């Protein structure tokens, strides 16, 4: 069912390397485009992922990268997903920087917010939402990728908030202080992602070290307004950064806000 026969996979092109190793573009039964994570030995806690894949198979939204299945009668496993031709949102922004109208930037934000509203409705946390974890297809559509996958990482520099790889600059204060994850820490990260989009892929808090960033946000300081963002757009991303998690809006509310502004600005 979810179990895919690796004999049905053709490996066509390498797409790069991530936290779990090499990812390739290929075909399933020679016809259907797919992306295949060829999990690297030692990079993932595969046993727990295989069980959690049973839940994740039921997460289906047009703005979520779709899990197609898993090859588990072999080790290490393969994770098969929808293919996104334009790759990482972060690189897409940086390459297409002067080619985007502001209306286009807001629709990208909307795409991600739709995905996250769906995950929120399923009480499913992303845990590492950022432009680097969003992909872009051949329609210029942004989809959210590798939601929930932080759980399975075997890399202390990534999983520890004091590690060199921990996504400090997307983390809400309660994540950094107490490792308290919730849909409200995903909301905080989404605000930073909106900032990345409107900054055409600039690194947030680029001048700061992770510890300087943690101190900065603890004191109530935030990110500045990218000039391509109107005050209406900036208000949306800024609302994501309330000190108190329970005062942050839900993705349902954010989506409504984004659609309001899309009407107003075009
Ligand atoms: C998700 C991913 C990773 N990253 C990870 O696997 C990863 C693992 C764990 C994490 C956590 C830390 C959160 C646990 C994060 C990420 C690394 C390499 C490739 C892909 C990937 C996936 N899919 C599903 C695609 O369609 C695709 N598509 C591409 C299409 C094109 C190109 C490309 O080479 N391009 C783009 C267009 O113009 C030419 C250059 C590259 C990738 N690229």
Numbering used by the authors: 394 to 659
What does the primary publication say about this deposited structure?
Btk is critical for the generation of calcium flux in response to receptor activation, because it activates phospholipase C-γ2 (PLC-γ2), which produces the second messengers diaceylglycerol (DAG) and inositol (1,4,5)-trisphosphate (IP3). Btk dysfunction is the cause of X-linked agammaglobulinemia, a severe disease of primary immunodeficiency. The Tec family kinases have a lipid-interaction module attached to the N terminus of a Src-like module (i.e., concatenation of an SH3 domain, an SH2 domain and a tyrosine kinase domain). The lipid-interaction module of the Tec kinases is an extended plekstrin homology (PH) domain fused to a Tec homology (TH) domain.
We replaced six residues in the activation loop of Btk with the corresponding ones in Itk, shown previously to stabilize the activation loop of the Btk kinase domain. The overall conformation of the kinase domain, as well as the specific conformation of the activation loop, is very similar in the two structures we have determined. We also determined the structure of the isolated Btk kinase domain with the six mutations described above and found by comparing it to wild-type Btk that the mutations do not introduce major perturbations in the structure. The kinase domain of Btk has low catalytic activity and autophosphorylates very slowly, like the c-Abl kinase domain and unlike those of the Src family. For example, there is no detectable change over 90 min in the level of phosphorylation of the Btk kinase domain at 4 μM concentration. IP6 has no effect on activation of the isolated kinase domain of Btk, suggesting that it is not a direct allosteric activator of the enzyme.
